[PDB]
Design a binder for this molecule. Structure first.
Ligand SMILES: [Mg+2]
Ligand SMILES: [Mg+2]
Ligand SMILES: [Mg+2]
Ligand SMILES: [Mg+2]
Ligand SMILES: [Mg+2]
Ligand SMILES: [Mg+2]
Ligand SMILES: [Mg+2]
Ligand SMILES: [Mg+2]
Ligand SMILES: [Mg+2]
Ligand SMILES: [Mg+2]
Ligand SMILES: [Mg+2]
Ligand SMILES: [Mg+2]
Ligand SMILES: [Mg+2]
Ligand SMILES: [Mg+2]
Ligand SMILES: [Mg+2]
Ligand SMILES: [Mg+2]
Ligand SMILES: [Mg+2]
Ligand SMILES: [Mg+2]
Ligand SMILES: [Mg+2]
Ligand SMILES: [Mg+2]
Ligand SMILES: [Mg+2]
Ligand SMILES: [Mg+2]
Ligand SMILES: [Mg+2]
Ligand SMILES: [Mg+2]
Ligand SMILES: [Mg+2]
Ligand SMILES: [Mg+2]
Ligand SMILES: [Mg+2]
Ligand SMILES: [Mg+2]
Ligand SMILES: [Mg+2]
Ligand SMILES: [Mg+2]
Ligand SMILES: [Mg+2]
Ligand SMILES: [Mg+2]
Ligand SMILES: [Mg+2]
Ligand SMILES: [Mg+2]
Ligand SMILES: [Mg+2]
Ligand SMILES: [Mg+2]
Ligand SMILES: [Mg+2]
Ligand SMILES: [Mg+2]
Ligand SMILES: [Mg+2]
Ligand SMILES: [Mg+2]
Ligand SMILES: [Mg+2]
Ligand SMILES: [Mg+2]
Ligand SMILES: [Mg+2]
Ligand SMILES: [Zn+2]
Ligand SMILES: [Zn+2]
Lengths: 66, 102, 257, 51, 108
RNA sequence: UAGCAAAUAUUCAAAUGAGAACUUUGAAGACCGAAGUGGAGAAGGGUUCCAUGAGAACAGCAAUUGUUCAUGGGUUACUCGAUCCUAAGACAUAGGUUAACUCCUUGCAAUACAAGAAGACAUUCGUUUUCGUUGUCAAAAGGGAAUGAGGUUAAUAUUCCUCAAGCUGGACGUGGUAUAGAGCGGUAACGCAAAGAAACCCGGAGACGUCAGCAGGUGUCACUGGAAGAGUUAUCUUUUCUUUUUAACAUACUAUGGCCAUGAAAUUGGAUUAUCCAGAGAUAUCGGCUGUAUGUAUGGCAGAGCAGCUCAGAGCUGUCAGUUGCGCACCUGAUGACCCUUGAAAAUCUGGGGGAGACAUAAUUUCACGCCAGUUCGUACCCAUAACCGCAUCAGGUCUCCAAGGUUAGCAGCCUCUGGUCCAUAGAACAAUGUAGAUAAGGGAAGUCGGCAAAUUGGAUCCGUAACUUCGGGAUAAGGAUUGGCUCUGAGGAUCUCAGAACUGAAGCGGACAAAGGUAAUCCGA
């Protein structure tokens, strides 16, 4: 499992059978890409990055929420 | 503090074996556990590693020594005399080879 | 009608079989290269180590092979004073220095030597023991004979062309420190064929040994046994010319001279 | 124990099968004297040879 | 107090058989098999025995898994020798050839 | 009839059954007391494992019960082990010996020797090229490519399920490094996803003893505030117990040492508990580089696990923040001491020196991301006061790992928590004799071949301590005192030891446990 700090690489990865898993925690939110040998997590604190990334969900990738 | 009068390192043997035997031994033991001056780096760091084998920790040289000593008197003697005989060999042959010119 | 220990030492399946697992290599000389007969080859002491059965240290010597790219490692006998990383010279022209190897005929009378050769190209025979040296007595004019004086002190005539190491075998003196404990004796003999401990032939019953007498513990038969004594017969001091300790009439060694 | 050869496994299997009781319907045959299987064996009282 | 169980069918305590106690998300204390430590990489010259810098100390296998970096250094003998030995080598070679030529001209 | 008496223990109610001291649930009382009567292995056993059922026999009383009988069912692996490697060793082949059988040699490989391997084109041969003396077996603790947590079965699981990883061998795809010869930065240690190659020669790891102390980490144990639950509540107790967890693996940082600068040290300094280091360059710089995590943070990850509370399978709440230890077990790091001891090897992974060849529409390259595969065998269960060996369900014997609290020098003994267990035929009487356990007024070996047996002594602190001697010793010599409780006082340290004083008891206090009786001679053997 790898995690990503900078949204850019994350977006290069979800731009590269693709599905995206978003999960809510009290203080934080996480976005999760499945790829052959790695599970990519992306965490953010503030709601701005949050909504912005929710926007970022493309038609190619389907969004699952737990 | 002076901890022993006669015995020294021999005290490990405690009361065993008889005096004279561990006299002989006091001698030898103190020989083998002594630090020696290294010919090469000139430190007195040379210690014995194995029976015939001595090392200088700092300069990393290993030399073939005697059993309880670094330097065996009869070996020093053989060096001294090897040299002296070198001198005589060369002086002789080299000198009388001038007689061969006749 | 039992078999003494005396006899049991020649069995090769037996219990007395050397413990060889520690042996590093045989300690011998270089092969007899052309280089050695007509010139000199030089090598390094990569190290001088301890072989578990040996009193004398062994020298590990790098040589460059004359005929190929390979680097040749060899194990020589430590000449006292040899240093790790030393240059060692072997051959005809090699000069006289501690640990170099020349023919004896080139070594000056009165010089001290190691690891001499009985037949030319032994890769060594005489004076290999720790601290041992052989003494150079004389040369024939021809150059083909040399009188050596062996550690035992017997004089021997060796073809002069034979290989010798200048100097004395290393690690001398060990024989002088008394061994106090039995355990020491034990570990020591652990690395060689077992000689230890030694049970006196009298302790044993007549079945285990000619000696063990019986009710008293004596030999009861002359313990000087003749050279031709059969396998199980040969027990005491064999073929002995003298027996006792010479005290008092020691002037005889001198007056008899 | 745990560790076994094939050979072993197979042999053990064999003796395991051979250790069944005479099937209750064999005793009803016309030509048989056999009430029971005389060759049955119990691991505790008798041991096999496998090494 | 939690107690453990070997997981390997080797119950004997051998340098290769070592175990470490790990605490799981389950709340269990589980034996996990710990690997063996290896000796650091030393310069190969005679009597030198220096610890090489900038090379990874890794169990022999993982050496196929690492990046070229850890396998090496940038000197003339990067992997095999330390700087001191390199240096002394350079110097020695140069000066030795110098003496060689000198002997050559003195012969001619 | 002898006899069924070692290993402290059982008791009550219900249920089931023809029948219960001996089965199942519950309620009590005790034991093993983490050197276990606990949790798992190796050897050995081989189905003894699981479920259902049960007449006889067997389970030396009994049985509704079973290690017994009958019937069915259980042992899933790229990452565990075998398989590979080498060892002590051993055996072929070749050669030799024998009437013959047999026997002798062989890794430092031969008492042998016209014995091999590789490459390429060919792709069969053949052709061709290169280098070459010649085998195999022996380790389920040695070496040894990579996996973890959670969940599941009546019985298997690092194997199955779910989720998350790594390894080796394939084969291309897409991006990207490098070159008209073959990365770039730093003075230097060295650095950075990547940066051409054959023969050949050398390396590193693998790869290693025993002991002693120091330092750190993991696990455990202890303590602190918060929250949920539980025990106690006549009295007292802001109480007593419980949960409060984080796998392999990914990225970044720190980590006992070693290096590189700059500068050189005498009124020598530096430094460890100990050693030890320095002009062969110490100490010291807002200096720098590098190596090892069973460390920290984040990812994994909370969605799992754990603890509570609801609803009639769905639901909700919390799982938080600290401190210390010469504590303990293990591991690691830096050392030290020791040897007439000096502590495997090979397979395997990898690096260096060298630059013969190969190649323009080209050639070759230890970067990413994607595609494919991982075969064969062992995986049940016992490992013992009932699954082994002792003709047995025998008080014997049989190789390992994990270990809690209190007292304490202590892994001793004694008592406890987790987990396990009460199984050893039972009832009643209470004579002699016995087996084991204790205590005897006055005397004190008079007993007896003999102080046999018993008794005395015993910890710690303070006193005091001979002859003899190989000067090490003798030595706890001999001997003399003290020891509880309670209330105070002082001293040693960081950003738990030691000593004083006073008071108080049937003058008791190492209160159990634990724990030497001395002395003087003679003989042997050091
Ligand atoms: Mg995967
Ligand atoms: Mg004194
Ligand atoms: Mg044989
Ligand atoms: Mg002597
Ligand atoms: Mg006889
Ligand atoms: Mg008699
Ligand atoms: Mg006598
Ligand atoms: Mg006698
Ligand atoms: Mg078995
Ligand atoms: Mg049996
Ligand atoms: Mg039997
Ligand atoms: Mg009886
Ligand atoms: Mg029991
Ligand atoms: Mg058990
Ligand atoms: Mg069990
Ligand atoms: Mg062998
Ligand atoms: Mg053989
Ligand atoms: Mg492995
Ligand atoms: Mg799996
Ligand atoms: Mg691959
Ligand atoms: Mg060591
Ligand atoms: Mg609390
Ligand atoms: Mg540092
Ligand atoms: Mg939850
Ligand atoms: Mg500690
Ligand atoms: Mg232990
Ligand atoms: Mg060593
Ligand atoms: Mg290169
Ligand atoms: Mg038994
Ligand atoms: Mg009774
Ligand atoms: Mg009395
Ligand atoms: Mg009296
Ligand atoms: Mg009295
Ligand atoms: Mg007595
Ligand atoms: Mg004293
Ligand atoms: Mg006293
Ligand atoms: Mg006395
Ligand atoms: Mg008091
Ligand atoms: Mg006081
Ligand atoms: Mg008082
Ligand atoms: Mg008392
Ligand atoms: Mg007495
Ligand atoms: Mg005695
Ligand atoms: Zn030196
Ligand atoms: Zn070096």
């Amino acid at each position: 499992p790898k995690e990503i700090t900078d949204i850019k690489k994350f977006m290069k990865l979800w731009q590269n059978k693709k599905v995206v898993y978003v999960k809510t925690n009290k203080r934080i939110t996480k976005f999760k890409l499945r790829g052959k040998k790695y599970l990519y997590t992306f965490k953010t604190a503030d709601p701005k990055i949050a909504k912005g990334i929710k926007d970022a969900i493309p038609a190619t990738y389907s969004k699952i929420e737990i | 503090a002076k901890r022993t009068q006669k015995v020294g390192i021999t005290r490990k043997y405690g009361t065993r074996y008889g005096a004279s035997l561990r006299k002989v031994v006091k001698k030898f033991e103190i020989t083998q556990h002594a630090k020696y001056g290294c010919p090469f780096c000139g430190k007195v760091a040379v210690k014995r590693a194995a029976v015939g084998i001595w090392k200088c920790k700092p300069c990393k040289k290993i030399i073939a020594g005697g059993a309880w000593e670094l330097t065996t008197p009869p070996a020093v003697t053989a060096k001294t005399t090897m040299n002296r005989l070198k001198k005589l060999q060369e002086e002789q042959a080299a000198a009388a080879a001038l007689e061969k010119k006749n | 009608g039992r078999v003494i220990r005396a006899q049991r030492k020649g069995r090769a399946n037996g219990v007395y079989k050397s413990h060889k697992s520690g042996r590093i290599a045989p300690a011998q000389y270089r092969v007899y290269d052309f280089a050695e007969r007509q010139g000199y080859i030089r090598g390094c002491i990569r190290d001088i180590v301890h072989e578990p059965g040996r009193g004398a240290p062994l020298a590990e010597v790098a040589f460059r092979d004359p005929y190929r790219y390979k680097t040749n490692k060899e194990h020589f006998i430590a000449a006292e004073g040899q240093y790790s990383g030393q240059y060692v010279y072997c051959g005809l022209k090699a000069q006289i220095a501690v640990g170099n190897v020349l023919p004896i005929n080139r070594i000056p009378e009165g010089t001290v030597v190691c690891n001499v050769e009985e037949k030319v190209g032994d890769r060594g025979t005489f004076s290999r023991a720790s601290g041992c040296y052989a003494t150079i007595i004389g040369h024939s004019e021809d150059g083909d004979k040399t009188r050596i004086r062996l550690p035992s002190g017997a004089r021997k005539t060796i073809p002069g062309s034979c290989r010798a190491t200048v100097g004395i075998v290393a690690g001398g003196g060990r024989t002088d420190k008394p061994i106090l404990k039995a355990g020491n004796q034990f570990h020591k003999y652990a690395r060689k064929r077992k000689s230890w401990p030694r049970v006196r032939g009298v302790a044993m019953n007549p079945v285990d040994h000619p000696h063990g007498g019986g009710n008293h513990q004596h030999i009861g038969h002359p313990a000087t046994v003749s050279k031709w004594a059969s396998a199980g017969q040969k027990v005491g001091l064999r073929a002995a010319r003298r027996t006792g300790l010479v005290r008092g009439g020691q002037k005889e060694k001198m007056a008899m001279k | 124990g745990a560790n076994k050869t094939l050979n072993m496994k197979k042999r053990f299997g064999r003796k395991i099968k051979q250790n069944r009781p005479l099937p209750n319907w064999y005793r009803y045959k016309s030509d048989t004297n056999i009430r029971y299987n005389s060759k049955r064996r119990n691991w505790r009282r008798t041991k096999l040879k496998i090494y | 107090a939690q107690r453990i169980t070997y997981r390997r069918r080797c119950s004997y305590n051998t340098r290769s058989n070592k175990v470490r106690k790990v605490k799981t998300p389950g709340g269990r204390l589980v034996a996990q098999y710990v690997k063996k430590v290896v000796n650091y990489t030393k310069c190969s010259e005679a009597g030198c025995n220096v610890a090489l810098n900038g090379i990874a100390q890794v169990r022999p296998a993982e050496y196929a898994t690492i990046a070229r970096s850890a396998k090496t250094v940038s000197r003339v003998y990067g992997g095999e020798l330390c700087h001191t030995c390199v240096r002394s080598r350079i110097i020695r070679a140069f000066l030795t050839e110098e003496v060689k030529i000198v002997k050559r001209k003195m012969i001619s």
